[PDB]
Ligand binder design. Structure first.
Ligand SMILES: C(=C1/CCCN=C1c1cccnc1)/c1cccs1
Ligand SMILES: C(=C1/CCCN=C1c1cccnc1)/c1cccs1
Ligand SMILES: C(=C1/CCCN=C1c1cccnc1)/c1cccs1
Ligand SMILES: C(=C1/CCCN=C1c1cccnc1)/c1cccs1
Ligand SMILES: C(=C1/CCCN=C1c1cccnc1)/c1cccs1
Lengths: 209, 210, 214, 212, 212
């Protein structure tokens, strides 16, 4: 409940309870079903676009949510959420398939845990990608796709789930402007292994101002 | 007179470490942590009017209280330095940063016997902001918003310090740029999707090429 | 058992067992024989090519597998595989002998351990190499060779062998890159130095590529 | 007795028993006297456009902690110690615009009388006055260094040479003079001062006269 | 018996029980003798204006700690050991102008007779004499390597080839000769000397066009 959110001892006790119960290295599968992970990229900036190399340098807020109901507690007289270092938590092992630089995390590495077991982790990331930059100087713009999913968990273990112009988020001072952002679910079988991986394809349709 | 009593200092640090919860916000009573922050600009290193990006160095003055850390300093040190890893510090971020904050200074805070904490890292960082007009007489106005990344307004308030007349007092005379005005104001951020508001300080840096 | 994959307590128990048994700093030699490590590079991108200095910056999936039967478990009624942080496991001490930067790991540092004891570690790596870049802007392209093997274990301790599947070597290469891969070979190779009797078994990867024409 | 290995291990143990790495080693209720001397080795880059220099210096840093002393009548006079086992002064350069990059093993020497010597080779960029670098009298780039969080009552930081024994002969530049002077700074708001050292690096480009 | 896994695990346990990673392994109150041999792999960038070079080399580093030795009559002769479990010499290059970037797994070999071999591949930049690089006789770039904090009484650092087994075919440069000569450095202010190896890299631009 709101009134108790700022009760420090309660917050300390919740963090203790979460660290007691959390298994940071085991997927939080419940009821023999895959962990349902939702990913939403809020684009903040498009910093460099190279039409010769088909590369983009971007900043996005990666809103990542899933549940671990073993973390839940009765918050009828305690805080409903706390901030938790992600090192204390399991986090989905997401990777961007067409990323060509390491992800630069620009923000404090803390997640929110809600008393119903919901977890929210939303880092600001700067990262470079190989994608189709063709058309960026035209009115219809370019469409750059970013493909994200679990790097080591197949669809039986983790599933990823997905039409905005990101007006609340995207920098008005970018040389570029966003026309549309859409996400589509993807299921892929790769050469290495017989089971499929789920991914989200995020399509960033943008153009130079 | 007691500042240099080493055993006293050791005991204060012991006490602080016994009491400190580095991962828990220090909400006293049932009120949000009152965090004060002010950027004292030290340098403007690179500016790009085409890309609207700036590279700057600033003192990030950060202060708050945790009364549980207070001690009787009648016959002991009034202040000690403490590694920030031993303390809770606010999870501040700049919303329009496009690089990680590069901390240039030792990551030590000062804890005062009344429980006041002062952390002031010197930081180099790059931002996306309005660089238009930087070569004109009236200059460009680049705004930086700084707030708690994961704590909403009910948990942490991030407000300007009481002093902002000194925001460019420590600015390098050897910069290619000169600062015309700095304001630092309360600002609240909300998103249509969700109930949380985030309290930040909006810093408006008005500057121009010399 | 694939039906038991989402049994969380089972996964946690398997992880516990692996960590009790694993010796992260000791080679998993079985039967006084060398550890057979398989390595195959699947190329994803070529980021920079410097004709002046003969250097290339590349992104590749480093497919790495080996066995440690001591990690094996009965999976008749439990998960067939789990993900494990590589810090809990022995991993081969591989290095590229002509690399001129650190390998930059772009993906989560987790391996897969299979119930028969096989381990699969496949990081995406961005790394720079010194190699032959002449010909890149011609029809027949440039050929850059990368040699990968154990840095400290000679052939008596570790054998580093290629896989025989190469059809996917450029299958995940970016369609948007300025470059295109013409051919890839991955072959067994052995290096010895005149000073000493040790041989080092490695995989030699030959990457034939060119700049796409207008 | 220097190479008596067991003696060295015992000294390291004794130091780690008594060392308080996060507490200033104030003795007899006086400030810690910290000596600093920058021995410049290389001037890597000078940007006349931006007033920036990129340099390498050896940061000779000394102070005492008598609690670390031992009787060395029949034991080693000195050992090397990882600085993570020691208190070290929280020095910062006020006009640094990059992180200090330490190029050398992060070990200090501890002497049996309790003297500590820490001398990293540091590469770091500074904002300073580079005008005149192409003239006969050269540029003078001043670097201000002191304790970032300790006032003069807690730490005092204290310091003429042309650095000929240290500066690279192969540098593009040559050093005319390096001066290092005591500097006390009090901020208007508050009563307590910081003790700093002002290092003045007077240098110039070799072969200033060119054919254009 | 090399591949007996339990044997290797027991050897690593024994090494970790006896190893003092922070204490120099002096035997018989004599200095630790460290051998260093740089195998040059590549010369990546050279600048004759600033006298800087960017190179890659394998740093073959060897020394003994007999306390680590074991009877290998019926056990492995050698094992790989993370260097964090071992004392390693605190070597530094005096004229380095960037930090040593270690490109390889940080593992050493320990031999059952107590011999230790650590050989990182290192990329690093140096200030040295690059003059003559575009001539037949070439430039000679000297790199001075020694213990950073141990003087000659504590550590001794001791060492002709063209490195044709190691040097990259694809360098824009070629090696004429690499020599390594024992050297010793002393400074006027202080008594002790530092032993170092002086590595003389004689090299030149490959396949250069000449005026004849
Ligand atoms: C989250 C925001 C917006 C303000 C910045 N921090 C956060 C945040 C909140 C919680 C955890 N991590 C970061 C948002 C979520 C949806 C729209 S915005
Ligand atoms: C590996 C893939 C493809 C799908 C993404 N994850 C994996 C994976 C599987 C196991 C461990 N680490 C990553 C491949 C490697 C080579 C061709 S496919
Ligand atoms: C060592 C080599 C050559 C193969 C690469 N690794 C090693 C190695 C071997 C052991 C430890 N660290 C690296 C050599 C030594 C002399 C000539 S070669
Ligand atoms: C603080 C200064 C000025 C001198 C440098 N360090 C500090 C400092 C002090 C405390 C903690 N962290 C850094 C100032 C505050 C107001 C005017 S100046
Ligand atoms: C110290 C030197 C010379 C260069 C080698 N190492 C050291 C060193 C010695 C001890 C600790 N840290 C570094 C000097 C001091 C004064 C003139 S020279």
């Amino acid at each position: 409940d709101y009134k108790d959110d700022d009760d420090k001892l309660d917050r300390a006790d919740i963090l203790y309870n979460i660290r007691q119960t959390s298994r940071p290295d085991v997927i939080p599968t419940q009821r023999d079903r895959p962990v349902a992970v939702s990913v939403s990229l809020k684009f903040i900036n498009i910093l460099e676009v190279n039409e010769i190399t088909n590369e983009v340098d971007v900043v996005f807020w990666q809103q990542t949510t899933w549940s671990d109901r073993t973390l839940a507690w009765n918050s009828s007289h305690s805080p409903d959420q706390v901030s938790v270092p992600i090192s204390s938590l399991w986090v989905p092992d997401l990777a961007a398939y067409n990323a060509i630089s390491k992800p630069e995390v620009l923000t404090p590495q803390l997640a929110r845990v809600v008393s119903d077991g919901e977890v929210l982790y939303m880092p600001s990331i700067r990262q470079r990608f190989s994608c189709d930059v063709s058309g960026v100087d035209t009115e219809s713009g370019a469409t750059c796709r970013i493909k994200i999913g679990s790097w080591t968990h197949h669809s039986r273990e983790i599933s990823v789930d997905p039409n905005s112009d990101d007006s609340e988020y995207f920098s008005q001072y970018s040389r570029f402007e966003i026309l549309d952002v859409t996400q589509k679910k993807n299921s892929v079988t790769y050469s290495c292994c017989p089971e499929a991986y789920e991914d989200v394809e995020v399509s960033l349709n943008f153009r130079k101002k």
